[PDB]
Amino acid sequence: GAMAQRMVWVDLEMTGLDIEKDQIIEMACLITDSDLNILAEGPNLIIKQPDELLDSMSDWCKEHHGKSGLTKAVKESTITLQQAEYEFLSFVRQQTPPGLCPLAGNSVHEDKKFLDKYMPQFMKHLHYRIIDVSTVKELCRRWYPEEYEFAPKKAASHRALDDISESIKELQFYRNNIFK
Amino acid sequence: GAMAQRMVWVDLEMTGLDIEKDQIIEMACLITDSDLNILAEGPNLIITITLQQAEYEFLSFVRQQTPPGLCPLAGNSVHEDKKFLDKYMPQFMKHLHYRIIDVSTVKELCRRWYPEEYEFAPSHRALDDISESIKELQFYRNNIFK
Numbered sequence: 001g002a003m004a005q006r007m008v009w010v011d012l013e014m015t016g017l018d019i020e021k022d023q024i025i026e027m028a029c030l031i032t033d034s035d036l037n038i039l040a041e042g043p044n045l046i047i048k049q050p051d052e053l054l055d056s057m058s059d060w061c062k063e064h065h066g067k068s069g070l071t072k073a074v075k076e077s078t079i080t081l082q083q084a085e086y087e088f089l090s091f092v093r094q095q096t097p098p099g100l101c102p103l104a105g106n107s108v109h110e111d112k113k114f115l116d117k118y119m120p121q122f123m124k125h126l127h128y129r130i131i132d133v134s135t136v137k138e139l140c141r142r143w144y145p146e147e148y149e150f151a152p153k154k155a156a157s158h159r160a161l162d163d164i165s166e167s168i169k170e171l172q173f174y175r176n177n178i179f180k
Numbered sequence: 181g182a183m184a185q186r187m188v189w190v191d192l193e194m195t196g197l198d199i200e201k202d203q204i205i206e207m208a209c210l211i212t213d214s215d216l217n218i219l220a221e222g223p224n225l226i227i228t229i230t231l232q233q234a235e236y237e238f239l240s241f242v243r244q245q246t247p248p249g250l251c252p253l254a255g256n257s258v259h260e261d262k263k264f265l266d267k268y269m270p271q272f273m274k275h276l277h278y279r280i281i282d283v284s285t286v287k288e289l290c291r292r293w294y295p296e297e298y299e300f301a302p303s304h305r306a307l308d309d310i311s312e313s314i315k316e317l318q319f320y321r322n323n324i325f326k
Contacts, residue, residue, distance in 0.1 A: 005292065019199075034292045102288065107279055109259035130259055135285040138252055142185050142214040143325065178326050179293065 004097050005034040008126055009104045011163040012111040013070060015049065015057050023049045024081065024114050025065070025074045028160030029088055031095045032104075036172050042091040044161040045084045046070065048077035068157045085119045092125050102129035106137075106167045133171045136178075144178040151177075184250035185214035188242055188276055191309040192261045199263055204231060208307035209238050211245040212254070216318050220245055224307040235269045242275050249274075254281035256313040283313050286320045297323040 013026035029042030054071055065071045092101075103126050105111055112130065115123050140148045151173050154166050190209045196202040209222035222241040225234045242251075253276050255261055262280055266273050291298045301323075302316055303309040 109262055109280060109282075112259060113263060129288050130282070130285065131288055132259075132280075132282055132285045134279045135282045136289070138279060138281050139286070139321075139325075143321065175293065179289075180324050180326050 001033050001035070003095075004100045006039065006096050006101050007032045007034070007036075007104045007131060008092055008096060008101050009164045009168060010108065010111055010115070011105060011160040011167065012114055013065070013157075013160055014114055015053050016061055017110070019113055019117060021053075021056075022114075023047075023053060024084075024118055025049055026070060026160045027084060027088060028164050029091060030161065030164045030168070031092075032168060036168060036175065038168070040095055041161060042095075043084075043087045044159050045079050045087060046073040046077050047079050047081055047084050049074055051075065064157065068159075081118055085122050088119065089122045089125060092122065096125070098125055100127050102127050102131050104131040104167075105133065105164070106170070107134045108132050131171075133167050133174075136171060136174045140174055140178050147177040182214065183247055186219065186246050186251050187212050187214070187216075187254040187281055188246060188251050189254045189310045189314065190258065190261055190265070191255055191306040191313070192264060193306055194260075194264060197260065199267060202264075203227075204234075204264055204268055206306045207234060207238070208305065208310055209241060210307065210310055211242070212314060216314055216321070218311075218314070221307065224305050231268055235272055238269065239272045239275060242272065246275070250277055252277045252279045252281050254283075255310070256283040256316070258282045258284075283317045283320075286317060286324075290320055290324050294324045 009030040009032060011028050012024050014022050014024050016022040024047055026046050028044045031039040033039055054074060103112060108130060188211060192204055193206040194202050194204055204227050206226050208224040211219045213219055223237055227234055253262055258280050259282060290301060302319055303312065
């Protein structure tokens with residue numbers, strides 16, 4: 001299909017939910033065509049942030065980023081936020097025409113909040129539209145409870161790029177099972 | 181599980197899109213069941229009233245209609261509305277679930293996957309904008325869902 005009909009899937013991992021204090025610690029990007037066919041995997045980058053920020057994280061955040069092995073990789077990182085944005089923006093410019101492709105993901109409103117503040121040039125390459133798999137998830141649970149039960153459970157967190165894969169798989173499941 | 185499957189619909193008008201500088205001009209809220217039937221209509225406030233009182237009016241309304249932390253925020257391009265709400269109405273957002281139901285996601289899937297249905301798919305107040313967003317979602321349920 002047309003490059004203007006491609007989707008830009010992102011997944012971010014952050015120190016918390018507070019847009020004033022918290023920072024982006026991991027990011028991944030993936031391109032699919034309009035029908036969710038896999039076109040190209042983008043960078044998977046672990047971004048350096050201070051130790052003070054990593055220790056002030058919520059008890060849920062501290063354990064979940066520890067078992068996935070992220071906090072260790074954040075502490076050994078040489079990638080700055082600015083360097084990561086340059087990598088992500090370069091990749092999407094090579095894959096999509098400017099300001100025409102949507103952001104896609106799971107509860108991707110949360111990621112957009114952090115991308116709007118900390119990666120505004122990357123966000124200018126994207127159109128205003130959002131494709132949020134979690135809106136489809138909520139409608140599946142209500143309107144198609146039988147199909148919702150058969151969907152696979154999500155795997156344990158590894159890296160942001162694997163989380164995007166699970167989000168794509170989830171929306172493909174919805175298309176395959178609850179769309180006309 | 182019928183109560184946890186209800187939806188908290190909102191629509192807001194702001195002075196712009198910057199969270200640090202812009203403010204909430206208008207807000208409306210209403211509750212639908214899981215099948216989109218309107219169970220109760222809330223107030224359509226011009227912010228005339230204050231933001232903290234508007235939050236008390238809306239928090240009182242959703243506390244007598246849905247259980248805390250189980251029902252999502254629902255709307256059309258509600259990602260921008262959720263940003264202004266998390267900041268300026270954090271006690272209201274504490275009553276809702278972390279996920280949201282955004283009709284603009286369904287519109288976009290309709291546009292791509294159902295171009296024919298998309299071509300024949302279907303405001304002065306913010307409450308009227310919610311009513312039209314529900315009719316838009318009901319159209320997608322009927323025309324593109326199995």
